Design a protein around this ligand. Structure first.
Ligand code: HEM
Ligand code: HEM
Ligand code: HEM
Ligand code: HEM
Lengths: 146, 283, 146
């Protein structure tokens, strides 16, 4: 990916403390709250009328776990993100029609969520490592768009 | 942009920041230089090492400016006028950098306000920062001047009856050059010569003709279109800059004589205005 | 940096008709007019107050020729843009302090200048090939920033 040995360890270490399900639901929920236009893909999910409703929506939470679970699995393949996300990239393009900008928005929200969750432990260098990781993951997911 | 609820949220959050504003500002700056190194190009005269007096000093000036902005949230343009002048005319920081510092201030607030940073406050602070950024960047080129409005009307005039054909070409150019824009049209046949693209191109062109006619009253002229894109189509805002670019290329390809540098600058400002309007109701 | 056969031939064929001296002065001049904050790097160039001032300024023209001249060199090395521009990348970062976003803006303007100059000949598929090229060159010039 290109991240130095110390950046990879900072990333991994913090991620070992992440409840993927909780953070997943929190990040997808905040994405839908902070950038409402991303709700366009989730009308089958039900009530998304208020921040509370979005955060408590069981479909949003379930999708959040699914999305962050795949992200989680991608942290094990930091040297080959494009390869790991190739089929998901094609799926999001050809079948889901998800504008790649959405991945970048999720990345920003995920970083704010880690910062809220971890406070002082999310230091400027740790953020910097995570910024490279979220940009890499978004680039890999957008790679097969045509 | 900001609703009263948003203002109450920002006021609350920033209040909690209180005496730490200066320290949070320095941390946000440090977070920006580290996460986004291209931002250092604007500070080659600074000692950018952790804890420098220069970064701490600057951090306090940035936070005092946001405090001023919070305190005059209903009158931001005026409260920050000297700052927008300094950035637009002296500093000339590319506008893309404001989103970067805004994200880093947001991450800083998140790390320091565990109780206060709820989803609703997060959304409000994000909108607040995007508004501050917009104010500090408003005078880079400014609103449309009479020379601009005159240039746009003259150039759009020459387009005339070709408007729909140029709108279709602009869409075609956009789909080919920026493939991601195709994600919003999975129901269309996007092949060259497509009647759906031609028909849609005519609609975009007519909206722009309408915007040119109402250049001094654009927000109302485009109100229904703003609602439509904001709440029904929900097109991510970044895409508007891509279609604007493609419309400019189409105009250049067809107006050998009128696409002078001054007209080019006026049309770009005009399209950025139409884009701002079409996306004003997103949040 | 991968281009399909049709995209490379589109780029090459068109570039052979380009008078670099002329197109270079045009592109740099328009960049300074359309995005005036870019003038911060050319304080010593003289009079940049009005479009006609910028467009006829001999130093702007001279510089545009140098810039497009180097850009032309990159066209001959489409397969390795990063390697070709590394020296200039470091130079733009370390000594000149040029925000890489300026490279993207110049790319937009150059596309407008090519459409303006060639008219009907700068077709949608040709523009699309040129968009890949200017994005590649901009990424190649920002690669050594730190
Ligand atoms: C880190 C970024 C993301 C990753 C790794 C990710 C991962 C996934 C995974 C693993 C699936 C299921 C694939 C399958 O069923 O075969 C999926 C489905 C989906 N994704 Fe993504 N995705 C990401 C971001 C997004 C974003 C930001 C959006 C839209 C705002 C989005 C919208 C969807 C939708 C609508 C589906 C289909 C859900 C369903 O059929 O129930 N994805 N994605
Ligand atoms: C949204 C946040 C921003 C605010 C509120 C802000 C505020 C300020 C303030 C209060 C000053 C000092 C005024 C003076 O001493 O006369 C200043 C200076 C400056 N700003 Fe900004 N700014 C913002 C974003 C940016 C960005 C994103 C950059 C570029 C990365 C930037 C680069 C600079 C530079 C180079 C200076 C002059 C520094 C010096 O020589 O002391 N600003 N800004
Ligand atoms: C600033 C330029 C834009 C203008 C002036 C504009 C104008 C319009 C107009 C007039 C309509 C027809 C609305 C109706 O049928 O009542 C519309 C529909 C639509 N627009 Fe935009 N729009 C702009 C940019 C965009 C962009 C950048 C995208 C996406 C890349 C987009 C995607 C759509 C979609 C998906 C439709 C629905 C088409 C259909 O299903 O028939 N728009 N727009
Ligand atoms: C198309 C991308 C670009 C290329 C290939 C390019 C190429 C060059 C070249 C060949 C030089 C001469 C260096 C030397 O004498 O050793 C140079 C200098 C310079 N470039 Fe770039 N450049 C590009 C874009 C930009 C942009 C958009 C800006 C900023 C607006 C910029 C600003 C400068 C400056 C300030 C100099 C110094 C001029 C002087 O000595 O007064 N460049 N560039």
């Amino acid at each position: 990916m290109h991240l130095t040995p110390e950046e990879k360890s900072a990333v991994t270490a913090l991620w070992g403390k992440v409840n993927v399900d909780e953070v997943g639901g929190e990040a997808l929920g905040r994405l839908l709250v902070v950038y409402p236009w991303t709700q366009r893909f989730f009308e089958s999910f039900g009530d998304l009328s208020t921040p509370d409703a979005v955060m408590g929506n069981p479909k949003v939470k379930a999708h959040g776990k699914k999305v962050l679970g795949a992200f989680s699995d991608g942290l094990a393949h930091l040297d080959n993100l494009k390869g790991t996300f190739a089929t998901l990239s094609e799926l999001h393009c050809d079948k889901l029609h998800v504008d790649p900008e959405n991945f970048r928005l999720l990345g920003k929200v995920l970083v704010c969520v880690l910062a809220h969750h971890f406070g002082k432990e999310f230091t400027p260098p740790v953020q910097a490592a995570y910024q490279k990781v979220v940009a890499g993951v978004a680039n890999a997911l957008a790679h097969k768009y045509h | 942009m900001l609703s009263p609820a948003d203002k109450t949220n920002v006021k609350a959050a920033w209040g909690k920041v209180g005496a730490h504003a200066g320290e949070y500002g320095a941390e946000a700056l440090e977070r920006m230089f580290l996460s986004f190194p291209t931002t250092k190009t604007y500070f080659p005269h600074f000692d950018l090492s952790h804890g420098s007096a220069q970064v701490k000093g600057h951090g306090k000036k940035v936070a005092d400016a946001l405090t001023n902005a919070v305190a005059h949230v209903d009158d931001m343009p005026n409260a920050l006028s000297a700052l927008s002048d300094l950035h637009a005319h002296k500093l000339r920081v590319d506008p893309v950098n404001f989103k970067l510092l805004s994200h880093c201030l947001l991450v800083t607030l998140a790390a320091h306000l565990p109780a206060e940073f709820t989803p609703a406050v997060h959304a409000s602070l994000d909108k607040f920062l995007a508004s501050v950024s917009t104010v500090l960047t408003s005078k880079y080129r400014g609103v449309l001047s009479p020379a601009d409005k005159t240039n746009v009307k003259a150039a759009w005039g020459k387009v005339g009856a070709h408007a729909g054909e140029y709108g279709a070409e602009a869409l075609e150019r956009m789909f080919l050059s920026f493939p991601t824009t195709k994600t919003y049209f999975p129901h269309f046949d996007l092949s060259h010569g497509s009647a759906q693209v031609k028909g849609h191109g005519k609609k975009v062109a007519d909206a722009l003709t309408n915007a040119v006619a109402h250049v001094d009253d654009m927000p109302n002229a485009l109100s229904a279109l703003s609602d439509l894109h904001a709440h029904k189509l929900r097109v991510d805002p970044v895409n508007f800059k891509l279609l604007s670019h493609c419309l400019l290329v189409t105009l250049a390809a067809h107006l050998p004589a009128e696409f002078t540098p001054a007209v080019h600058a006026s049309l770009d400002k005009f399209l950025a205005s139409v884009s701002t309007v079409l996306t004003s109701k997103y949040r």
